Amino acid sequence: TNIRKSHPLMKIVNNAFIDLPAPSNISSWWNFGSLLGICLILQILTGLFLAMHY
Amino acid sequence: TNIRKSHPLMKIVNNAFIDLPAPSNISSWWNFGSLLGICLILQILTGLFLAMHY
Amino acid sequence: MLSVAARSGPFAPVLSATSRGVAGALRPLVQAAVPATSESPVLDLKRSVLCRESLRG
Amino acid sequence: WALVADLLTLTWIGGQPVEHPYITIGQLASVLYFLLILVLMPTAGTIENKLLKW
Amino acid sequence: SHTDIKVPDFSDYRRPEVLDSTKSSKESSEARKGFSYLVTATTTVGVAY
Amino acid sequence: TATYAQALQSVPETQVSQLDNGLRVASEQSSQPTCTVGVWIDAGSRYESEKNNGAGYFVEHLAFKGTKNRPGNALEKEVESMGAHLNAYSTREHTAYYIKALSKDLPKAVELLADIVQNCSLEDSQIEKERDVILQELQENDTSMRDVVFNYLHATAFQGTPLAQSVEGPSENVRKLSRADLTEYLSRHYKAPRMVLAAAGGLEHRQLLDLAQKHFSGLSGTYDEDAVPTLSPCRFTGSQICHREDGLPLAHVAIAVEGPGWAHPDNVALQVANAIIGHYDCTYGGGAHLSSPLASIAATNKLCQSFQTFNICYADTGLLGAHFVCDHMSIDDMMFVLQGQWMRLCTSATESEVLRGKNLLRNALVSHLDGTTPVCEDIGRSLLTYGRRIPLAEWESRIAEVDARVVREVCSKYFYDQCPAVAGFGPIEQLPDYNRIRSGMFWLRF
Amino acid sequence: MLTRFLGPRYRQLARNWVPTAQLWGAVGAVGLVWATDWRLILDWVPYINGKFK
Amino acid sequence: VSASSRWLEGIRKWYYNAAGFNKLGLMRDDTIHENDDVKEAIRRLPENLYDDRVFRIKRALDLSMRQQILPKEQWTKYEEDKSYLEPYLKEVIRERKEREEWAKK
Amino acid sequence: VPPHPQDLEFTRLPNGLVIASLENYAPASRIGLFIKAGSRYENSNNLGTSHLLRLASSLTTKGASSFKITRGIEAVGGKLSVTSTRENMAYTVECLRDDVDILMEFLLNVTTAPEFRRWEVAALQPQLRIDKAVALQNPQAHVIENLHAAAYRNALANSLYCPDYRIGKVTPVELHDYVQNHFTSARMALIGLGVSHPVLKQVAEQFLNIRGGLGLSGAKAKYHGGEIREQNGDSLVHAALVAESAAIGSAEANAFSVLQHVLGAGPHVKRGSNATSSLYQAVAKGVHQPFDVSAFNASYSDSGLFGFYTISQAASAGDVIKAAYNQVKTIAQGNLSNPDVQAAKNKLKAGYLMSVESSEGFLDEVGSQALAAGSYTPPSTVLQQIDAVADADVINAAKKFVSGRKSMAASGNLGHTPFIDEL
Amino acid sequence: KAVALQNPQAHVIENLHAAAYRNALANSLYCPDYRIGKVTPVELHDYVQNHFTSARMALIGLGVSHPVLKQVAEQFLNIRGGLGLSGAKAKYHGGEIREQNGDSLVHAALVAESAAIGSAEANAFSVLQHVLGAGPHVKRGSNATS
Numbered sequence A, B: 001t002n003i004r005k006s007h008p009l010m011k012i013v014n015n016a017f018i019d020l021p022a023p024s025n026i027s028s029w030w031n032f033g034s035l036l037g038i039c040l041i042l043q044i045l046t047g048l049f050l051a052m053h054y
Numbered sequence C: 001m002l003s004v005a006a007r008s009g010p011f012a013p014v015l016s017a018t019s020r021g022v023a024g025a026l027r028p029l030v031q032a033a034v035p036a037t038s039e040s041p042v043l044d045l046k047r048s049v050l051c052r053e054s055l056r057g
Numbered sequence D: 001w002a003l004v005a006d007l008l009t010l011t012w013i014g015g016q017p018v019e020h021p022y023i024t025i026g027q028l029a030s031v032l033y034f035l036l037i038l039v040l041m042p043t044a045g046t047i048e049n050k051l052l053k054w
Numbered sequence E: 001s002h003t004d005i006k007v008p009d010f011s012d013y014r015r016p017e018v019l020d021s022t023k024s025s026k027e028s029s030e031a032r033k034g035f036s037y038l039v040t041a042t043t044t045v046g047v048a049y
Numbered sequence F: 001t002a003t004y005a006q007a008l009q010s011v012p013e014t015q016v017s018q019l020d021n022g023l024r025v026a027s028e029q030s031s032q033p034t035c036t037v038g039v040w041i042d043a044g045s046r047y048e049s050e051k052n053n054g055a056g057y058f059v060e061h062l063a064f065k066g067t068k069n070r071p072g073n074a075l076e077k078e079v080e081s082m083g084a085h086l087n088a089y090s091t092r093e094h095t096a097y098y099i100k101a102l103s104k105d106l107p108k109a110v111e112l113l114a115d116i117v118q119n120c121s122l123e124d125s126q127i128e129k130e131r132d133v134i135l136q137e138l139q140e141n142d143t144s145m146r147d148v149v150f151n152y153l154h155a156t157a158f159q160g161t162p163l164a165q166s167v168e169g170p171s172e173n174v175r176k177l178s179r180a181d182l183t184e185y186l187s188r189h190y191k192a193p194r195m196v197l198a199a200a201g202g203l204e205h206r207q208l209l210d211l212a213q214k215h216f217s218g219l220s221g222t223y224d225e226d227a228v229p230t231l232s233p234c235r236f237t238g239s240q241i242c243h244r245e246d247g248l249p250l251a252h253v254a255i256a257v258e259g260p261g262w263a264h265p266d267n268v269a270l271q272v273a274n275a276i277i278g279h280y281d282c283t284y285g286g287g288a289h290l291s292s293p294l295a296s297i298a299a300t301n302k303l304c305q306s307f308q309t310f311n312i313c314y315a316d317t318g319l320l321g322a323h324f325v326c327d328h329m330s331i332d333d334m335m336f337v338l339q340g341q342w343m344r345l346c347t348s349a350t351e352s353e354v355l356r357g358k359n360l361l362r363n364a365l366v367s368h369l370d371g372t373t374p375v376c377e378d379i380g381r382s383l384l385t386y387g388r389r390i391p392l393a394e395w396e397s398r399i400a401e402v403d404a405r406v407v408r409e410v411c412s413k414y415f416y417d418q419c420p421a422v423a424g425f426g427p428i429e430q431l432p433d434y435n436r437i438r439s440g441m442f443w444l445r446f
Numbered sequence G: 001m002l003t004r005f006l007g008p009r010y011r012q013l014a015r016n017w018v019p020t021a022q023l024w025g026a027v028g029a030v031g032l033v034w035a036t037d038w039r040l041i042l043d044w045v046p047y048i049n050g051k052f053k
Numbered sequence H: 001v002s003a004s005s006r007w008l009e010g011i012r013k014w015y016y017n018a019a020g021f022n023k024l025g026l027m028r029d030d031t032i033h034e035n036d037d038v039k040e041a042i043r044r045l046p047e048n049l050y051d052d053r054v055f056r057i058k059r060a061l062d063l064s065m066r067q068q069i070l071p072k073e074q075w076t077k078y079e080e081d082k083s084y085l086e087p088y089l090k091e092v093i094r095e096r097k098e099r100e101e102w103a104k105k
Numbered sequence I: 001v002p003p004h005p006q007d008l009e010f011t012r013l014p015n016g017l018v019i020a021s022l023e024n025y026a027p028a029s030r031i032g033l034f035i036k037a038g039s040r041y042e043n044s045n046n047l048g049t050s051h052l053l054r055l056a057s058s059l060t061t062k063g064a065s066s067f068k069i070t071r072g073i074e075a076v077g078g079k080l081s082v083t084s085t086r087e088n089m090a091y092t093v094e095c096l097r098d099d100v101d102i103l104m105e106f107l108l109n110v111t112t113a114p115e116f117r118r119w120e121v122a123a124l125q126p127q128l129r130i131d132k133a134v135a136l137q138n139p140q141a142h143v144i145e146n147l148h149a150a151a152y153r154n155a156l157a158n159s160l161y162c163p164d165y166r167i168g169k170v171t172p173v174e175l176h177d178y179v180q181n182h183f184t185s186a187r188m189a190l191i192g193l194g195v196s197h198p199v200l201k202q203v204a205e206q207f208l209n210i211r212g213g214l215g216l217s218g219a220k221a222k223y224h225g226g227e228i229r230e231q232n233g234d235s236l237v238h239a240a241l242v243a244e245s246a247a248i249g250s251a252e253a254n255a256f257s258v259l260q261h262v263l264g265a266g267p268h269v270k271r272g273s274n275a276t277s278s279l280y281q282a283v284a285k286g287v288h289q290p291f292d293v294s295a296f297n298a299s300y301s302d303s304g305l306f307g308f309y310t311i312s313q314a315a316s317a318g319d320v321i322k323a324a325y326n327q328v329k330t331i332a333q334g335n336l337s338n339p340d341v342q343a344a345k346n347k348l349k350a351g352y353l354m355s356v357e358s359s360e361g362f363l364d365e366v367g368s369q370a371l372a373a374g375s376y377t378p379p380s381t382v383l384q385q386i387d388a389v390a391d392a393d394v395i396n397a398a399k400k401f402v403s404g405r406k407s408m409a410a411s412g413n414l415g416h417t418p419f420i421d422e423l
Numbered sequence J: 001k002a003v004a005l006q007n008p009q010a011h012v013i014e015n016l017h018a019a020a021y022r023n024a025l026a027n028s029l030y031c032p033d034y035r036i037g038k039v040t041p042v043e044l045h046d047y048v049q050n051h052f053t054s055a056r057m058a059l060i061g062l063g064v065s066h067p068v069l070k071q072v073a074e075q076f077l078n079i080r081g082g083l084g085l086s087g088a089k090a091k092y093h094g095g096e097i098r099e100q101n102g103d104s105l106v107h108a109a110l111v112a113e114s115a116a117i118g119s120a121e122a123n124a125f126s127v128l129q130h131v132l133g134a135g136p137h138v139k140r141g142s143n144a145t146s
């Protein structure tokens, strides 16, 4: 059937951030999880740009 | 049952290099696949050691 | 007045391409949803009655 | 194998100065490469079909 | 007896345009939709800049 | 050989006639030795009030249980003893009592119909007995998942309107409702300009009138006046109701967006679009090869046990959608497909498929008006809802107009980016979240 | 062997998707224009002449 | 009929012999690249055939593995080579094309 | 002011094929090829072949592949449906007139050019399971299926649905043989509604001259008697008790047809006491609550079963069967009215007339007649026929029921359902 | 049941019995398919109190001594408040059950009501079986005495 549910890559993404079930319940204290990720890549990004001059 | 077949990490490894089916058939020309990987990490390794002095 | 089946009672299975499969001869059931409490599935491992290819505007 | 050798040829020409034979011979290796991959192999393959009765 | 089923009264959350059982929601739709769309539209504009 | 076109003109014009009363007596004479006469009333349940509710339904139960002139059970005895069939149904918008009978019997047929529709002996003995029954009915009804899900769709689609109500009402009214309540509903609603005498068979239209005049003279004549209210518009809501119950082995889901009422011209187009999506059932022959993309996909990957599109018409609104049934792990996919099909029809309906649907509609149209009863019931209903009786030829004419564009247009008007009314029953753990179903009501591509 | 896609329907398909395909390029360019402040192009837009000359 | 056709015939009997599947007891249809049309045709084969074809490919893959080849006596003789899949493959395609044509109108 | 109608035209070809048609100027057409290939022609070695057959009506034919039959038909909004009984099979195709030419073709390909390809048929066996499942979800199906299996040892005992042990086991060769065996000119009839006689005839003579199967409408059912009981737990016990009656067509079989209507068949008024129902009144008298009963009446080419079918709570079963039984027994005793037989007569006829109001209904009547009689007997005379039933005739029919070897099938909590023995 | 009914004889004898009686002996050794998943613990409870009582019980000991069994019995098996007799009393009836199968071999049993166990007649019958013949006595034999 579909596309998002069977494509080897897409599945992965889909079962991790699209369909994956989560408590209707969790509060703001469940943001620093993804905020950590943002911080990881933002470090990685600026970090990379600083390195082409450092 | 087992351990190697159900542990979230282990499975991965197991279904990619332990149990995964392969042609009883393939020849030497199926080595540069893994040889490429070796080359990737060997570059990465020495590459890393050269970088703490470069 | 032949038509063994629509002579009311014996069984007459009907398969279709477009419409739904039928089974339908004569024996009561009829004066039975009257003296009530005759359940029925609601599409339990099943099909669908009345079936279609009857409409309007 | 023509593709291989043509590549062995191509490498060799790549490693010789832009003068004498080497210019035109390289210009041929070139066309051949493209001519082989783009027209020679496909037709060669269609023929093999007609030879098998496929 | 599934006919005892009431659908809870919602006035308490309903936009003003959708409060009367007497009239269509057909009319208020464009606007209600426009409003929330304009909201994201602008948001993207903001994200764009 | 007589063509289809030509064949449409062959159908005899439906004779309509007005009583000095408000009764419209109509007919479609044919050659048959048998026929169907009955009364269609513009009484329903959208006409009843929160507490009145179940009235008509309670009245329909009482309808054949004795009149003033024909008491206890002789009504049956007479009807039965002449091998006639007495029947009655009632919906949110219409009520009908009809007799199936030998053509020669048109007279007493009518006499009977009159007596029923006018002199209804709602004896306390009965009205009492009857509540125990209607209670039972509701208990059985609760097992038909389908029956439930459609009531729920109605229940939430029309949140707040009278239309939101069911035909039988909640147990409460069936238990509390009194004769005064009944009597009142009859008097309020069962009046001439709201009822039609319809027939079909081997009868000369003149006879109908003679009878119509003979036993129905005496309704609105000296009546009507003040206390006759009109129909209030009903607000469609676009919500969802999910009655989770994992004890049931299959799920019923039933989605819809508000459609326009009976008389709107864009129904014909909506119906063609519908035919294109079609229906399905697991006893269908041909799976993979069904034309309908839904039907096919469904059948090939087993995404359901049966689905079916629809278009329910009411006064100035209606529900328009599909309803399906399936394994607990197939509600998503099933929804996915159905939804994507609607949009495809909104954004890119191809020319060829629209012809199939027009063809499917003609075959249904014609195939359905086969036999006195359906025709008789089409006359009545037609008069109540269209004001006229729309001749086949016209429907063809109407269908013909419709082409691809017409579909993608009308479809887009009703289905594109509109909020649905969702109704789910059964093991709906996987029925998509409402935002999600709503987000599926349009696509980012187009 | 693209002839599989050569028939009436296919024509009607691409036809229906034409106004959309058109609009998607209208989004696509204006988007590149504005993200690179296209000298060559922007100058013509009445306002957005924040480059005097 | 004469020199001309036997010429093309032996060109083939050559290319065939040249192809070399024979030396691993294969048959031309065993070597066919499996796509959709093919895959279905294989499905449609009867028990015996199917069963035979799997033992055939199995022998070959076993050969190809240990890089041997079959004794000359047992190589597969050109045109003693049964073209078992063709009728199915033909009809499987035949079918697809119909839906394909049906899809254009 | 409708036009005066036309007449059905009817033709027997020397080869045995019957052809009949009617030009109702209908905007649509119905064509049905009726075949004597009903389930009774299966045998201990191929039970179900006619089921899987009934189901294989859109597998590929020579000259029409599966896809096309499907796509082809749907394209014109037409329909293709095959319906079996213990005696016939009826391939009925329908559409608007301008389109018969294309349905008539498919029709023929299916009935006369079926390929039954291995992998298409394998693909379909499962549907026997799904199909039967869907059908057997009404107790009556099994009961009548068992009733029949009990009553006969022969052919009429064979079931409409494929024996479970046979699912997945009926072969394409069996389908092949079943067609050559039974779908031939002398066992075929071709009915046309909305087509013209010269066409059907031509179609017939061009396309339906097939012959080399068997010959008669039987192995000739041996009646036997006996009873089958299914322990169930359905709260309601379904039971049917019955005796051998009269073959279809015959005069006796209208005495019986009249009887059913004295004893009582279906209801005629939504939710009624069924005042004019000998059985239902005879039951309420002694039984106080949920129950239904009706006289049962099957009639085949060379036999028939008669009696009544009851549904009641597991403990009243006996009382209901025993009360039901005596009522018939009481007509056998001569206690039959006259205005009563008269009333019956009326229900019957009106019912019959009613039965063919519609096309789909009329086409089926003509189709079966063709095969049962090789005639087309107009309503006027069928009615004239029902009229000839003497009150004594009815009594006698009942007398026959009451006195002849019996057959019972029942399913539910049988713990209070009597035994026959015990009847 | 699956494992048991894989010998034709099981069903045949099961059906033989269901056919022969209307009563109690007709009940089957294996649970009716419609009952699987439906027999309740209360039914088990009732079935025990109903039938597992002193007057319907016997206790046999091989390799134990009488005083022990007796003590066990008197201490532990004095249970009583179920039913009383060895019957509802089977009503014999007759009849026959037939299963369409396709097993290449047809299994069939034909039978009449005989004599109750214990009784003298039932040894006349027990003797008969051996005249007519029961099992084989010699690996692969003609069964001369049969």
Ligand SMILES: CCCCCCCCCc1cc(O)c2ccccc2[n+]1[O-]
Pocket (backbone or CB within 6 Å): A017, A022, A026, A030, A033, A034, A035, A037, A038
């Ligand atoms: C914009 C970049 C996104 C950063 C991380 C992506 C989010 C995925 C992490 C999770 C994981 C998880 O289990 C939950 C549960 C609830 C809510 C959020 C959330 N995540 O964000």
Ligand SMILES: CCCCCCCCCc1cc(O)c2ccccc2[n+]1[O-]
Pocket (backbone or CB within 6 Å): B017, B022, B026, B030, B033, B034, B035, B037, B038
């Ligand atoms: C010592 C480090 C190992 C390098 C790569 C690990 C090997 C995994 C790659 C594969 C993948 C694959 O499909 C095959 C198939 C056949 C044989 C080897 C092989 N790999 O090695």
